[PDB]
């Protein structure tokens, strides 16, 4: 809502940050396996559960 | 003073917008500066040497045509 | 439009291009490309014209690029160059904005050389700076056009090949500045001698030094004689182009760096790089016409009205005849404060004039500066249509807000630029440096891209 | 402004249906 | 011109704090650069100038 | 805090300050809108910092 | 359009080049 | 004679005979322009927007039992078009329909 | 990349493919079948009927509840469709096929369609939801293609009011070629 605490206000900033795609050049990484972030969310499809 | 200040403030301001361009411009530092006055030096010295032969060697082929 | 792509459309359709490389060539071989392309040309500099008979010699025609193929130097397929984005930039011509037709483009330069060439050599050829041809007859006046036609040709083709990537940048840059560079070299160690009453005198200031530092039996004569020469050059001369030079290097290198990235992708970060100097050597250029017409103008209007002084006050002319050329000088009036002073002396005997001629240099060349960004589609309009259509943006900014942040730099790196362009070239004439700062700024620009060039691939190399 | 250019640029911009596919792209050429 | 620890040790305590806030307002100075496009120079003497701090930090405590 | 804000961008660029606005950032960061006094040029000061 | 090849310039130039001699050394060496 | 004009009267009441409320202006328009396809034989049909005023003045379900139309063929422009004519539809205005013929209109 | 089959003069013929298209498997393999062994030129004027409904491709195999038409009669068959998504892909494919034709210099108003094969490609997931709270698949089912074109005795010349078209062109084709440029 509007009415928000500190608190909770910066855990959705933390899951803010950590939604986006990977950076392409970790792909030319030596040992690299990850293709894509497999831990995106989206806001209607799963509820973050607080 | 209208004919003054019409004129005065544009040129004024010319130079308060000089100044702060070359506050802006990233100036070559000494190490830079150093690294290309070498390099230039040199590549001078290649093309104009090249050519100063050139213009030399024909000079008494130049004499055999004329 | 129409009946000027479809005019053009046909003759390009039989023009000759090159071939592309398929795969990306090595450095090595680039420079193998690179040093016979310079080799080439300057063998045909050293070649002076077959049939040039009458007048302009044969002494000259020995010695110097006067008289030589390449009497037009660059200039034919450089003013192509610069009338077409004139025009481009000018709006007289609509933009064929496909890559093939923009090829097709360039096309029609590359036609505009070549009628330039035969333009200004049929020209010459009439103005009798070979002679008259009722007197050499048309057979050596065709042959002064073809030699100096195929030429272009050549000059104009070998260029290309290596900007395309069979070589290393652009031969015209890399022919202007040798020759700027073997100027300067050959004034600094030509082995020519002149007859003095004295005796022969080295051309090379160099080779005079120690040619006078050896002969003379006082030291202290020498010191004087080959560094203050005025009939021939001295190593002062050759010490003030040192110091320019330097500080041409040191001012090579401003510029504001702004921020862009790609709109597609994230990170990615690049500079959009606006130097000092915006506008090159043009504006000097345009103040050289100004200055140059000026004076052709106000010597025949006085001629015909010297009675006015509405003519009179503009300028007073006197016709100098000092061995070479007749030399205009502006006696008085307008004209004399809108020419140079000749000597040091004369700078100080007349301190108001200095500041008024000085002043007026600037002026106009960061004005000429200014107006010409706008002429040639390098405004801030201009520039943020470019980003746009490359997909570029800056970081927090929209599309339209690009155009006010550029503003903040472009017109005023355009006058600065103009009036340090402006400024350099008085300094370095006044210090008497040779070629003067449009040479210098050329020549230092260019030997930066070839070191760019060889320091990347150095990695390896 | 008149309100009266509200009709008259809706009557000129009917008139399109018989220039299909070389409609002007603006009616105020000048500037 | 690189800090190292070695040539900070004798040194004394208002010497380094003067030492420290000139890296400081040398780093203040990167991170304004970071944001205005600075060149990758003056990127990568961001980390080069963090850890001068942290030595000089170091040598005090 | 604002007083913090206020005092540190006066030593850091020895500038008067007339007062300080402040949000946290979706992202939390927290944005300061510092405003100069009138003796001051924002413009000129963001050269002198290099903004602009 | 027309296209030509990189060496087709070297030698086609070249061969001008020499051309540019004949006509230097036989119109000098036929009338001297 | 490829550009020629005629004028008609589209009899709408037998051309939507039966045709449900909701469908009734819009099966006019359908009808419109598939007369005028028959009669000038051009794919390429564009009804004027006088014309749709026309047909839809007194709602979906009240269509205009006739109306006086005009064809005119005129050249395609457009030389991308496959069809180099095409059929333009405008309306006419007409206190009565009695006695009124199929005309040719000269230009 | 294999084919099913060999063509019989490699020199004499033309190939094209596709894989992972998003039209009916059912639909273009019944659709294949009806141009299977025709003239290209023949085979692309038919394709065109079916889009305009003036011919149909008889559902032979996959024929479960098809209607009847009176152009099916024309195939000694009483099932037929106007698939035309299938028409419209094969199309794209004999294009692309032809062109083939043309950079192997080949004479491109003999070609006959030889082989022609549609080939089941993995199908794509999505769902639909179902009464009592039940989730169902909602499934694609996509197809490779491939036809292999060989030259025969008979010519048919093009089209006059085909040859005749314009070149297109395409805006967005022009900006990526300039952003590349
Ligand atoms: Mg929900
Ligand atoms: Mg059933
Ligand atoms: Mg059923
Ligand atoms: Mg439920």
Not at chain 3, 16 to 35: D, G, H, M, N, S
Not at chain 3, 225 to 253: D, S
Not at chain 3, 337 to 364: K, N, Q
Not at chain 8, 19 to 42: D, N, Q, S, W, Y
């Amino acid at each position: 809502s509007s009415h928000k605490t500190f608190r909770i206000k910066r855990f959705l900033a933390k899951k803010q940050k950590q939604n986006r795609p990977i950076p392409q050049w970790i792909w030319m990484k030596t040992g690299n396996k990850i293709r894509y972030n497999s831990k995106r969310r989206h806001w209607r499809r799963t509820k973050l559960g607080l | 003073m209208d004919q003054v200040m019409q004129f005065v403030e544009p040129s004024r301001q010319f130079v308060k917008d000089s100044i702060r361009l070359v506050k802006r411009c990233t100036k070559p530092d000494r190490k830079e500066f150093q690294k290309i006055a070498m390099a230039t030096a040199i590549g001078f010295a290649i093309m104009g040497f090249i050519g100063f032969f050139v213009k030399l060697i024909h000079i008494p082929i130049n004499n055999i045509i004329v | 439009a129409i009946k000027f792509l479809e005019v053009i459309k046909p003759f390009c359709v039989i023009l000759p291009e090159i071939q592309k490389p398929e795969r990306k060539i090595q450095f090595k071989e680039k420079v193998l490309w690179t040093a016979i392309t310079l080799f080439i040309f300057l063998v045909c500099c050293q070649i002076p014209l077959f049939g040039i008979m009458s007048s302009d010699f044969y002494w000259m025609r020995v010695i110097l690029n006067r008289g030589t193929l390449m009497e037009l130097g660059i200039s034919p397929i450089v003013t192509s160059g610069l009338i077409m984005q004139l025009l481009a930039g000018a709006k007289i011509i609509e933009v064929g904005d496909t890559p093939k037709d923009r090829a097709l483009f360039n096309g029609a330069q590359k036609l505009f050389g070549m009628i330039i060439t035969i333009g200004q050599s049929i020209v010459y050829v009439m103005t009798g700076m070979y002679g008259d041809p009722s007197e050499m007859g048309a057979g050596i006046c065709l042959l002064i056009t073809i030699q100096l036609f195929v030429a272009g040709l050549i000059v104009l083709l070998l260029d290309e090949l290596l900007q395309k990537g069979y070589g290393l940048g652009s031969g015209i840059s890399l022919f202007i500045a040798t020759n700027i560079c073997e100027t300067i070299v050959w004034k600094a160690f030509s082995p020519t001698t002149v007859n003095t009453g004295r005796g022969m005198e080295f051309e090379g200031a160099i080779i005079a030094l120690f040619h006078l530092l050896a002969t003379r039996t006082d030291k202290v004569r020498a010191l004087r004689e080959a560094f203050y020469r005025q009939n021939l050059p001295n190593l002062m001369n050759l010490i003030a182009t040192i110091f320019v030079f330097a500080v041409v290097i040191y001012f090579q290198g401003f510029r504001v760096d702004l921020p862009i990235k790609s709109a597609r992708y994230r990170g990615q970060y690049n500079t959009y790089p606006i130097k000092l100097f915006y506008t090159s050597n043009i504006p000097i250029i345009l103040q050289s016409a100004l200055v140059s017409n000026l004076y052709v103008i106000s010597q025949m209007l006085s001629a015909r009205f010297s009675g006015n002084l509405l003519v009179s006050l503009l300028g007073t002319w006197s016709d100098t005849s000092s061995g070479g050329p007749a030399r205009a000088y502006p006696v008085g009036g307008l004209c004399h404060y809108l020419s140079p002073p000749e000597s040091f002396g004369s700078v100080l005997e007349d301190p108001v004039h200095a500041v008024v001629y000085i002043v007026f240099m600037l002026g106009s060349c960061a004005f000429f500066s200014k107006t010409w960004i706008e002429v040639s589609g390098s405004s801030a309009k201009d520039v943020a249509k470019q980003l746009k259509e490359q997909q570029m943006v800056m970081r927090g900014h929209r599309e339209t807000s690009m155009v006010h942040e550029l503003n903040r730099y472009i017109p005023t790196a355009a006058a600065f630029g103009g009036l340090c362009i402006g400024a350099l070239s008085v300094l370095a004439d006044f210090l008497g440096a040779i070629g003067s700062g449009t040479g210098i700024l050329l020549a230092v620009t260019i030997i930066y891209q070839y070191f760019e060039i060889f320091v990347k691939e150095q990695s390896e190399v | 402004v008149a309100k009266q250019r509200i009709r008259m640029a809706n009557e000129k911009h009917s008139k399109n249906i018989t220039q299909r596919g070389n409609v002007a792209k603006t009616s105020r050429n000048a500037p | 011109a690189k800090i190292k620890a070695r040539d900070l040790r004798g040194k004394k305590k208002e010497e380094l704090l003067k030492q420290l806030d000139d890296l400081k307002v040398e780093l203040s100075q990167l991170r304004v650069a970071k944001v205005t496009g600075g060149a990758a120079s003056k990127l990568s003497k961001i980390r080069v100038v963090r850890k001068s701090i942290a030595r000089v930090l170091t040598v005090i405590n | 805090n604002k007083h913090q804000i206020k005092q540190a961008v006066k030593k850091l660029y020895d500038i008067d300050v007339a007062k300080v606005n402040t949000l946290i950032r979706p992202d939390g960061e927290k944005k300061a809108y510092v405003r100069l006094a009138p003796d001051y040029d924002a413009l000129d000061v963001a050269n002198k910092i290099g903004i602009i | 359009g027309l296209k030509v090849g990189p060496v087709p310039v070297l030698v086609m130039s070249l061969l001008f080049i020499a051309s540019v001699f004949m006509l230097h050394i036989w119109g000098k060496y036929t009338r001297s | 004679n490829e550009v020629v004009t005629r004028e008609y009267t589209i009899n709408i009441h037998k051309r939507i005979h039966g045709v449900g409320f909701k469908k009734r202006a819009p099966r006019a328009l359908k009808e419109i322009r598939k007369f005028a396809m028959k009669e000038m034989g051009t794919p390429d049909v564009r009804i004027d927007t006088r014309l749709n005023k026309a047909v839809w003045a007194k709602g979906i379900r009240n269509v205009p039992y006739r109306i006086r139309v005009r064809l005119s063929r005129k050249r395609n422009e457009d030389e991308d078009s496959p069809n180099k004519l095409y059929t333009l539809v405008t309306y006419v205005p007409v206190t009565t329909f009695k006695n009124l013929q199929t005309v040719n209109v000269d230009e | 990349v294999r084919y099913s089959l060999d063509p019989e003069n490699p020199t004499k013929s033309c190939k094209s493919r596709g894989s992972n298209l998003r039209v009916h498997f059912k639909n273009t393999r019944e659709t294949a079948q009806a141009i299977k062994g025709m003239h290209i030129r023949k085979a692309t004027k038919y394709l065109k009927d079916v889009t305009l409904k003036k011919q149909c491709v008889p559902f032979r195999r996959y024929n479960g509840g098809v209607g009847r038409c009176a152009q099916a009669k024309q195939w000694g068959w009483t099932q037929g469709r106007w698939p035309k998504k299938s028409a419209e892909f094969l199309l794209h494919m004999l294009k692309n096929a032809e062109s083939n034709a043309e950079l192997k210099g080949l004479d491109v108003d003999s070609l006959v369609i030889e082989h022609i094969q549609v080939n089941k490609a993995p199908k794509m997931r999505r769902r639909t939801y179902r009464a009592h709270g039940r989730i169902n698949p909602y499934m694609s089912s996509p197809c490779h293609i491939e036809m292999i074109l060989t030259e025969k005795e008979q010519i048919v010349p093009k089209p006059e009011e085909e040859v005749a078209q314009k070149k297109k062109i395409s805006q967005k084709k022009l900006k990526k070629q300039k952003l590349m440029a």
